[PDB]
Amino acid sequence: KVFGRCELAAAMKRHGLDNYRGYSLGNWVCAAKFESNFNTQATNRNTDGSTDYGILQINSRWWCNDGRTPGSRNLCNIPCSALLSSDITASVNCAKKIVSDGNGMNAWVAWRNRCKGTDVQAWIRGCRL
């Protein structure tokens, strides 16, 4: 499923991401836009044998089990396939653990490269939240 911008914003706001750990809703919407372009089916294979899954591109090396990543840990206790659903609940709950893992939102390279330090409030424009 491909979320509309405000549609995703509402869904995330609904799952408690606005200001979570001090990160405004805009940050999360911006991260999602550049990580997966709001596509819940997005997947990206990495050259290290791992793969990034879903709307927030969570990595199979440490966060979810996809049964084909060497020395993988399943810290979120879920199959990576669950991160490819139309319901973002799984991704958000796992993301909440990642953002608290000692690097803030720097864990998402696309966020760091295209959202960090910018006027992220723009990603919420026109939304009736």
From Swiss-Prot:
Pfam families: Lys
Catalytic reaction equation(s): Hydrolysis of (1->4)-beta-linkages between N-acetylmuramic acid and N-acetyl-D-glucosamine residues in a peptidoglycan and between N-acetyl-D-glucosamine residues in chitodextrins
GO cellular component, one term: endoplasmic reticulum
E.C. number(s) listed in UniProt: 3.2.1.17
GO terms under biological process: cell wall macromolecule catabolic process; defense response to bacterium; defense response to Gram-negative bacterium; defense response to Gram-positive bacterium; killing of cells of another organism
InterPro entries xref list: Glyco_hydro_22 (IPR001916), Glyco_hydro_22_CS (IPR019799), Glyco_hydro_22_lys (IPR000974), Lysozyme-like_dom_sf (IPR023346)
Superkingdom in the source lineage: Eukaryota
Note in the entry: Lysozyme C is capable of both hydrolysis and transglycosylation; it also shows a slight esterase activity. It acts rapidly on both peptide-substituted and unsubstituted peptidoglycan, and slowly on chitin oligosaccharides.
Protein name (record): Lysozyme C
Organism in which the protein naturally occurs: Gallus gallus
Gene behind the chain: LYZ
